[PDB]
Design a protein around this ligand. Structure first.
Ligand SMILES: [Cl-]
Ligand SMILES: [Cl-]
Ligand SMILES: [Mg+2]
Ligand SMILES: [Mg+2]
Lengths: 195, 195
């Protein structure tokens, strides 16, 4: 089965993280949540106060063979990711071993740009944090998939469905992405993978 | 000053619950989460495995001064709600005291219909459970607000933003609902409270 490592830190955006996890599970992807920047503590207080329990500390799962690493946004959670040497090295290792990096909202600008992980990749993120993404790299689009570098980015809490569906499409295929989309009662405007 | 009691059970739909909580907090609404687990456990495993911590057992907060009681869906979470005499009594008390009941996905058909809490009024819910709503009550709308009985219902994980925004409208007003919506990068098919 395909698998995903979803990272969580104090201040992660809970709608982004939880919507993504839920959709991936609906897609038949095995999801492990990892606590970042918590010295092993699994209880994570998210950006609006939602409290989640992660499965494991990052240091215990970072070398697993997951197909994708997912970085939720949330201002402070993304800062924790940026300032975690283990998180940054893990992202780099996923990329160099041919796997997918997926990041939403503040995570592209806060994590990927300062560490120069994808120096010429195309990416999006939260629109009013546009200035923090190099102008030549920026696209203002609900989801961006840069197939060349296997970088998936997305914009905000309201694009979390679009983000999760594209992960499903990439790891388990279009038909499964459509099946999941069909379970949700999605808003007009969001791509449902029927075509 | 407005406040919301968001109920949680084993098997609740985590995207519905968490998206709603996040939006209400963004709207300046005080949120308390209440576990309806039969043993009072607060560490809830949701329908796709997300582990969410409730603030309090329902018995400790049911008599509180909340403007709305929120029932997330999730097949098994809604069954837990239906089968909890305290939950059902609390919903009835919110309604009889002139407060709002808000329910999404399976919660209308599983909780509200069998207990006949709203014998008259329009409601929606998850479309595969349409035949579990009395035909004279059913509408196929992303959100249904029946002000005559102060009943707010909605359809599924993908309508959680619409649902949360309508709670904001009902507790705080259109201006705040538009403010919150404007934060989210939400899809064009979701009403944004701007005219
Ligand atoms: Cl760790
Ligand atoms: Cl690059
Ligand atoms: Mg550069
Ligand atoms: Mg009847």
């Amino acid at each position: 089965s395909a698998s995903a490592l979803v990272c969580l830190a104090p201040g992660s955006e809970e709608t982004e993280a939880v919507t993504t996890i839920d959709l991936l599970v609906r897609g038949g992807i095995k999801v492990t949540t990892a606590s970042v920047a918590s010295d092993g503590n699994l209880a994570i207080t998210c950006s609006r106060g939602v409290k989640l329990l992660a499965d494991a500390p990052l240091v215990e799962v970072a070398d697993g063979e997951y197909d994708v690493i997912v970085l939720p946004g949330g201002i402070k959670g993304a800062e924790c990711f940026r300032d975690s040497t283990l998180l940054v090295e893990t992202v780099k290792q996923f990329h160099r071993s041919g796997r997918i990096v997926a990041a939403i909202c503040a995570a592209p600008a806060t994590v990927l740009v300062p560490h120069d992980i994808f120096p010429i990749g195309n990416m999006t993120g939260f629109p009013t944090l546009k200035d923090k993404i190099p102008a030549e790299q920026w696209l203002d689009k609900r989801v961006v998939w840069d197939a060349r570098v296997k970088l998936l980015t997305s914009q905000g809490p309201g694009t979390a469905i679009d983000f999760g569906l594209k992960i499903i499409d990439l790891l388990v295929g279009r038909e499964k992405a459509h099946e999941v989309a069909s379970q949700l009662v999605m808003a007009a405007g969001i791509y449902n993978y029927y075509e």
